[PDB]
């Protein structure tokens, strides 16, 4: 039967019961021991309430806000007898404030995004830089500097960000092995960074192709996606953003850096979901991805930074998302950007609506001696239905990563604020792999210069195919 | 009972029997009197042969080429007893050479594109300028200067180019009435051009939204369209191209003009089917179109040019395509450009495969006192099936325009080389209108600056919303 990893000896408070909460709840029930009445779900949606009622779980129909979160969450998280777990799978809530509250009260915490309080983005007073995931991540880094150690809080532990950090580590190990480089895997951050440098990894795409499709065609004036529409649109309207590698010799005129912080990022003064990059996955082969911001674009580049004695970066990989969402989401983006406004309605595809497809999600490491290597999951909707209820393949990659991070947090409960890059990647993948379908590593000789130049003049760098100059669609 | 407009007493030579030839043959049979034995279809494909044989029509299974066209076509065109009609609905053949051959032999001619001989669209030694539709059209204008008058040959008489020239005239008439501009309806080119000028028409989009969709979803690695895939891809890879208005104050850095010719055009050093423009149709409302080259982008701008005594243009409208094809074609373009190569297979949607949808095709005249006015057809697939066989809504708009052009040519058989702008628009619409479904005019207050500026800095011209600077997606 399914492994029960740990007893949770306190309340389990799940904030949000949308596509990911719905997929995560059954895994929590499956893999942890606890009295059923310890778990409570908080979400303002009537749709969510009705579903929770049908699952027989406690439900509080309330939006968590800047004004109520202390009065609501402190009693719930401290109900006893021991340590509770705050599982934050919401939109419109501050990850940082809720994380800090959980830690203050001795509750474990996990989320899948650094989300701000409602109102953050649609404010005309914010400069583009302040709307970046780099800036949001810096709030978490500052929180950790201010309060080192303490109760474990896992930031950004979904599929991507989250699982893909573990895939990067596995991929680096595999690349070394494939070269005949034997000897123990890295143990420390510096050793991981040096492995990437030593292997000559220039950069990393989070290279994803979602091929799920529904039994109904995309409706006019409806945004369709396989996970949060609100979340995807919000991030798609944030600046295009990337971890910025030391090898890069060019950036766009509308690229900007940061005065402060870890030093690993740039952003572009244009929306990520209307920015295309040339990328590749095993099933897609060459494809366009959208350069949507993501926490791990920064966090992986930061993690794999090698510095000199003076503290200047001497090696860092480029890292960013290259997302090809499901076809109906591609059409939804074309519709939304073309109309200059959000659609009147939206829907997230349910497993009962999906006729076939996979969520092919992995990491594409490039620039090393074997050109490019993609490592990741090819989870199909058919396999998903066999192994976990109430979610599609996109959802299961996320919910199983949350499961893995929860196991890690329960196993390592005094680790302070951590990102997926800080966790034991082998333990996490051990927990997650039963939910990932085929997990494979594939080399390719494809580069962004394949077939170029064509019929028109292009500004390309033929000396270094993987330069962002060649990847960015201009 | 369907009107039988005229008897055709000579050979009817149909070159090409793809989507448009298949839709056009039954209209020819319906609306002209002739012995069926006098029709001959020429196409290299087995598929075409089998369909022709099923219709009991003479078929010759040959590709027309530069090497064979004289020896192949002259006996067919001159078989008698009367004047023949060459109906050219092919790809990979020279419209100019066939048209000249038909004229030399006293046969009427019609086509829907200025096509070059096979090999042109991918000659690596061709400069971008030479790949433009402006350049191709100039070969036709030069032919007309060399041999004025004579047997009628109608160049570019499909839906667009073709029908939309007639819609522009009707739209100018309607605008004059609504804006209270007094004067007789124009009856010469110079009078039409002066009317556009007097109305303050800054520019025109050929503004199209195809919403046809099939009973099967888009297959991976298959290009799907509602008319020629080979044709659409070829034109999509030609430079983005537009008739260039005197009101325009800016053009992009990669825009180029022409040192000779009618003077009406610019092109961009990028492919038209990967170039987006902000546009509008009644059903789509605000949408992206692709800036795919089209003969009428140049021909309409040229037709509506007012020159001073010295022969310098003092008024000319901007004119270009803003094409939103069917959703499966949108996905096909994303796939093709994203992969950097044509898909391995393609298909044209048959009426038997299409579940619903329309081809909304009209002209959007902008910059006048009522902002913008769209005039055109909203033909549905359901109506198409009721009124004409063997074609979808896209096809019927084209085949019915060819029919109208044929009627006009028989009624005006010694008019020389003409474009759709040169034909009697009321007569042509009288023939075509039974096949166009709802034909409507709609005003809108939408402009390309709607909702702009937004989240990010943009290079806009706030003084004049309709500037290309604002329309082009950059
Ligand atoms: N790291 C990853 O791989 C990854 C993947 C998917 C989603 N996410 C993120 O996970 C989160 C959930 O995604 P989803 O697909 O379940 O989204 P969803 O849109 O399906 O659900 C969001 C849910 O949060 C709710 N909610 C809104 N305001 C709230 C508030 N004030 N308090 C409590 N709940 C509130 C909605 O009512 C709702 O049911 C999103 O923030 C998201 O961007 C991360
Ligand atoms: N003006 C408009 O509105 C408009 C609209 C649709 C199509 N078109 C144009 O009409 C033409 C036909 O379009 P379609 O949808 O029927 O295309 P299609 O791709 O369906 O058919 C083209 C046909 O030409 C053939 N052919 C190829 N090479 C040939 C040769 N050397 N000699 C004779 N025949 C040959 C194919 O075998 C074929 O059956 C295309 O050139 C096109 O771009 C114009
Ligand atoms: N990383 C993001 N920007 N969003 C989360 C995407 C989840 C789909 N695998
Ligand atoms: N992941 C990093 N960028 N740095 C290491 C942080 C370690 C937190 N305990
Ligand atoms: N005008 C073109 N570039 N192509 C012909 C388009 C036919 C769809 N109405
Ligand atoms: N349509 C033009 N641009 N000029 C007028 C041509 C008239 C051909 N008899």
Numbering used by the authors:
A (entry chain A), B (entry chain B): 3 to 476
Kindly provide excerpts from the paper associated with this entry.
All four variants of BvHSS lead to enzymatically inactive but soluble enzymes. All BvHSS and BvHSS variants co-crystallized with AGM were found to have AGM bound to the protein surface at various sites, most likely causing the observed improvement in crystal growth. In contrast to wild-type BvHSS, the variant H296S was found to bind AGM within the active site. The guanidine group of AGM was approximately placed at the former His-296 imidazole ring position. The primary amino group of AGM was bound and coordinated as that of HSP or PUT at the inner amino site. The side chain of His-296 seems to be crucial for correct substrate positioning.
NAD+ serves as a non-covalently bound prosthetic group for BvHSS. The interface area of the dimer was calculated as approximately 1700 Å2 by PDBsum indicating a stable dimer23. The BvHSS subunit consists of two domains as determined by CATH24: one “NAD(P)-binding Rossmann-like” domain (domain 1, residues 3–163 and 394–425) and one “homospermidine-synthase-like domain” (domain 2, residues 164–395 and 426–477) as shown in Fig. 2a and S1.
